[PDB]
């Protein structure tokens, strides 16, 4: 009888980079190179009256009203193929299952939703709120030069429901081709948020508490945070699917939505799909392969 692999790990398929921050003027965003990087300084702040706390602060210069947040996202193929396994039969059946999915569906839906979260500038976690206008440039860089360009209005497409778009479906198809295995895709993603002349910008976190994240003396959003924003795809959780998408986690993690009592959690779905040959709903197939694309260490620490 087939049993789940004791050890089963996957590798990241949507690999983003740290998103470096820079400051500039809105009307110069077309020539946005050489824009000075937003530096994080540590200021001293006075508190309550009954005394000086110190906090990391990142601001734009007094002459800059727009924040440029740029990262590079690389799309890889081979979602179902694990990185470490220890059951030949389980890995073979898992490869058969994932191959049957990729044949039947082809990543089109997941790629469309990932491209939505790229285009809406959701990765601008707090920098997006209170911005006058946000615009997303997405270039399909090949040799080192752009092969195709996309320009999007992050606020127009919102953050509530994936809708069909002519220009966005091209990016979706490109990401689907990347995920399918027809060639690794490399995209540079720039976001221009007119947060306000000399306002506060918000890089990722971690006497002083909550120190701001910076790479090479430049403010940045951590790659893991960008990945978290990317995979806010799941609108298939068992209750209140209309209120919006959440991130793809094994138990949908603010208690768990994908509870292993409703059986809709990732582990139960995968076990029923692979071992017992009872494929879940097509939507849940999307969910299972979405957290396979995310990658991690799954598997059984003790036999079932």
């Amino acid at each position: 009888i087939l049993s789940t692999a004791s050890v089963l790990a996957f590798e990241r398929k949507l690999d983003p980079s740290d998103a470096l921050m820079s400051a500039g003027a809105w009307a110069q965003r077309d020539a946005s190179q050489e824009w000075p990087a937003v530096t994080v300084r540590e200021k001293s702040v006075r508190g309550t009256i009954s005394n000086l706390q110190t906090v990391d602060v990142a601001n734009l210069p007094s002459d800059a009203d727009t924040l440029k947040v740029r990262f590079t996202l690389r799309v890889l193929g081979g979602a179902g193929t694990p990185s470490a396994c220890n059951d030949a039969a389980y890995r073979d059946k898992l490869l058969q299952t994932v191959a049957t999915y990729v044949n039947d569906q082809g990543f089109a839906e997941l790629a469309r939703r990932y491209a939505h979260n790229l285009a809406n500038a959701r990765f601008l976690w707090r920098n997006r709120v209170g911005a006058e206008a946000v615009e997303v440039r997405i270039n399909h860089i090949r040799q080192g030069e752009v092969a195709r360009a996309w320009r999007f209005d992050a606020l127009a497409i919102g953050l509530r429901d994936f809708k069909a778009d002519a220009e966005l479906d091209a990016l979706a198809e490109l990401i689907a081709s990347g995920l399918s295995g027809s060639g690794h895709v490399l995209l540079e993603v720039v976001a221009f948020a007119r947060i306000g002349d000399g306002q506060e910008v918000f890089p990722s976190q971690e006497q002083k508490s909550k120190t701001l994240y910076s790479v090479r003396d430049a403010a940045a959003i951590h790659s893991q945070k960008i990945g978290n924003a990317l995979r806010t795809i799941d609108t298939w959780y068992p209750d209140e699917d209309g209120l919006g998408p959440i991130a793809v986690e094994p138990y949908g993690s603010g208690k768990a939505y994908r509870q292993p009592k409703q059986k809709l959690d990732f582990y139960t779905l995968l076990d029923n799909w692979v071992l017992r040959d009872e494929a879940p709903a097509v939507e849940q197939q999307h969910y299972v392969i979405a957290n396979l694309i995310r990658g991690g260490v799954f598997g059984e620490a003790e036999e079932k």
């Binding site: 309550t48 990391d56 007094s62 976690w125 306000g196 002349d197 506060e200 918000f202 945070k225 603010g254």
Partner: protein
């Protein structure tokens, strides 16, 4: 002394007279203050910031960590100290201090949420956005305070 003649509809004049009588001032002085409005006022900025601080105070973000609560209490305390002042130096110190309270709160706020849109009670991002628009930039606010009160 010079005079300016205003051609306005009768309803507009009635509404203006009502507001003037409500605020306890004459019509010409009222409209003069309104035309030398200059949008936001350092005092109205601090008052609205204290109101936003109270709105966040009666919510969960108030009990998130010491930074958020200290920032809320600091904003309110410095607005109160500014309003009950007597010398421009205390007003300047209170305005600077008040922002320092906003900065404390903003560095105490979370950096990620769950779901599509953040629950404002547990994240406080929109309120912090509105008060950050009120204050403006750090250097901008400091320069404004030094020009007006310094």
């Amino acid at each position: 002394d010079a005079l300016i003649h205003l051609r306005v509809p009768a309803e507009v004049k009635g509404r203006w007279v009502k507001e003037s009588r409500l605020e306890g001032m004459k019509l010409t002085d009222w409209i003069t203050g309104r035309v030398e409005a200059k949008a936001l006022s350092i005092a109205e900025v601090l008052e609205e910031a204290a109101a936003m601080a109270r709105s966040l105070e009666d919510s969960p973000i108030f009990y998130r960590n010491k930074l958020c609560a200290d920032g809320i209490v600091t904003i309110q305390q410095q607005a109160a100290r500014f309003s009950a002042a007597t010398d421009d130096a205390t007003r300047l110190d209170a305005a600077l201090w008040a922002r320092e309270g906003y900065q404390l709160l903003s560095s105490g706020l979370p950096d990620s949420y769950s779901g599509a849109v953040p629950n404002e009670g547990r994240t406080g991002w929109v309120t912090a956005s509105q008060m950050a628009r009120l204050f403006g930039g750090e250097a901008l606010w400091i320069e404004r305070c030094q020009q007006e009160l310094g």
